[PDB]
Amino acid sequence: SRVAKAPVVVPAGVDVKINGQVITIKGKNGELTRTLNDAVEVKHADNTLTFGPRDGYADGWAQAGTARALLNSMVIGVTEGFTKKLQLVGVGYRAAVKGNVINLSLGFSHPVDHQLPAGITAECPTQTEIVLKGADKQVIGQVAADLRAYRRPEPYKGKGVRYADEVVRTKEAKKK
Template sequence: MSRVAKNPVKLPAGVEVKLAGQQLSVKGAKGALELNVHSSVEVTQESGELRFAARNGDQQNRAMAGTTRALVNNMVIGVSQGFERKLQLVGVGYKAQAKGTVLNLALGFSHPVDYELPQGITAETPSQTDILIKGIDKQLVGQVAAEIRDFRPPEPYKGKGVRYADEVVRRKEAKKK
């Protein structure tokens, strides 16, 4: 059995889980998420915990049980606490401004970049050079952060660009004569 799948997912107070066939829905204070559980994974709910097991013991099914456990754990954390990802803009004249569901970015191009945020994601700009992306779906929060970073990834010579707050940019030395 997968070592990840052996650990049960503890359900905090205020989180409700419904299992209907292979459809798992998690509801909490911040919202609700759904997941189609793979047919090779068996999910059981007992005394405030969710347990995962492979229906038969081959390697692929054990791996799928561990993957499902990790996905459900992220759903439980998302609906109870939420996820956030912080981005920093480094460069002269680089600015960000959140207006409703649109994030306006000035990244040194000849035109401003308007990024439409998907449903379930919010963006805050505590300062002009900081972006805070929040949501309940971990995968979607990371995807949105990656798409914003892709507009202007950090370059290795001056370090200018959009970077994650915890990212370390490897710097290169300029060419010598």
């Protein structure tokens, strides 16, 4: 029911600079946190999400539901920010955190690098747990997933880079 036609009214929780179509959310924690949602038939007034007449379709007030998700995700990035627990079972390998750059491994001899984009940073309490910490739910989950593409969980007994996967499959030797 609710979000398709009453778009949560995305409150101004300190604080929203709205040009018009270019949006900057201006708060402390990942400061001046910004997104350009353009005029995708998404009209705004103060911190509200308002429709117009899309292409052929004309929808039903749908991407005003979306625009409300993407601005609030953006606002909540600047207020609360958040825990990307990414983690390894994999016989440790590498997992040097160093500021903007992460050195991981997959048994592969070479520095695996990956340079974190500016907007986020990461650290490791122990090699097997990595917290990427910071700002925007979109770039941050992308860097997490691109790190788990340094290798999936192995599906039989689970070796790999684990982000949200607290459900890794537990297959077995020589059939059951």
